[PDB]
Amino acid sequence: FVEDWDLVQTLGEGAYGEVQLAVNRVTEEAVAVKIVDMPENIKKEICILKMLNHENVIKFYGHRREGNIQYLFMELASGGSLFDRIEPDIGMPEPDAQRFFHQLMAGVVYLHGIGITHRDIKPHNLLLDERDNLKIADYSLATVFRYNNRERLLNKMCGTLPYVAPELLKRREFHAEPVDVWSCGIVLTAMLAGELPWDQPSDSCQEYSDWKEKKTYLNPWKKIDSAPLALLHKILVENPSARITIPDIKKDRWYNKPLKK
Ligand SMILES: Cc1c(Nc2nc(N)c3c(C#N)c(N4CCC[C@H]4C)n(C)c3n2)cnn1[C@@H]1CCOC1
Ligand SMILES: [Cl-]
Ligand SMILES: [Cl-]
């Protein structure tokens, strides 16, 4: 009810809906509430949200419906979003970026292990708790890619153009896991350079061509140290069947480099 919760401010607009800081009128407990005006989509999102139990995935509290409105309740992330830790044109200190990337991979390993693909990994959807632990949020595009140990291919275009893998723009059907790996590499670029490399990974985009031609003397690549850049060379591979897998990311030199807080 409008009687149990006070909507204090907008936190943002999700893939499908919008998120308010709600304060409990009785207890003053502060949560995040997703406000959904209108379906089969929301039933599927709630069901995926109920599956989730991991330190690097957002906590789901539950849901209420009142008419053509529905309410989803989640752990309010007191640290806000990763997006707000990225300084435009700078990024953030490499040790902070490595720790976030470790935590991002842990959450993605978890999701992939329960057969879920996120499909919209980007810094707006990566939240931080009071100890700066990263939480993967927004399951509005999430879907099953593995069930009874059998993989299904994706055949729907969605996500955010600067984060989408090139196969999603080109192939009728594609594997879910390499698409989420790609978007994690764009997140890593953003954290280390404070800029996105291209509007979209299409041959008509000059910045994408420049990367395929290995011009890493250009921005954002020249801002990035040789070790993390070597990892990005393995992640941002156009052919998803040649792209590095998460088990191999875990073996990468930069991924395993001790860095000072
Ligand atoms: C406490 C806090 C948050 N905390 C928070 N906690 C969530 N749980 C979500 C959440 C979800 N779920 C979400 N959004 C927006 C739409 C997509 C989704 C990820 N956003 C954006 C969420 N933000 C964000 N800023 N601040 C403060 C106030 C402004 O700066 C610091
Ligand atoms: Cl910006
Ligand atoms: Cl950015």
Could you please describe the fold and organization of this structure?
The chain has helices spanning 40-51, 94-113, 176-193, 206-212, 226-235, 246-249, and strands spanning 5-14, 17-24, 30-37, 60-66, 69-74, 116-117, 126-128, 134-136, 143-144, 146-147, 150-151. By secondary structure, the protein is of the alpha+beta class. The protein has 2 domains: 1-87, no CATH class; 88-261, no CATH class. The chain has a 5-stranded antiparallel beta sheet, with helices on one face. A two-stranded antiparallel sheet has the order 6-9. Helix 2 runs antiparallel to helix 3 (176-193). The chain starts with a strand and ends in a 12-residue tail after the last helix. Bound molecules: the ligand Cc1c(Nc2nc(N)c3c(C#N)c(N4CCC[C@H]4C)n(C)c3n2)cnn1[C@@H]1CCOC1 and chloride ion (CL) (2 copies). The site of the ligand Cc1c(Nc2nc(N)c3c(C#N)c(N4CCC[C@H]4C)n(C)c3n2)cnn1[C@@H]1CCOC1 has 17 residues, from strand 1.
Strand coverage percent: 15-25%
* Inertia-based shape: globular
Overall structural class, as computed from helix and strand content, comes to: alpha+beta
Radius of gyration: 19 Å
Question: Which ions and ligands are bound to the chains?
Answer: ligand U0K, chloride ion
The sequence of SSEs as H and E is: EEEHEEHEEEEEEHHHH
Helical run tally: 6
Family: Belongs to the protein kinase superfamily. CAMK Ser/Thr protein kinase family. NIM1 subfamily.
Keywords: ATP-binding, Cell cycle, Chromosome, Cytoplasm, Cytoskeleton, Disease variant, DNA damage, DNA repair, Isopeptide bond, Kinase, Nucleotide-binding, Nucleus, Phosphoprotein, Serine/threonine-protein kinase, Transferase, Ubl conjugation
Main location: nucleus
EC number: 2.7.11.1
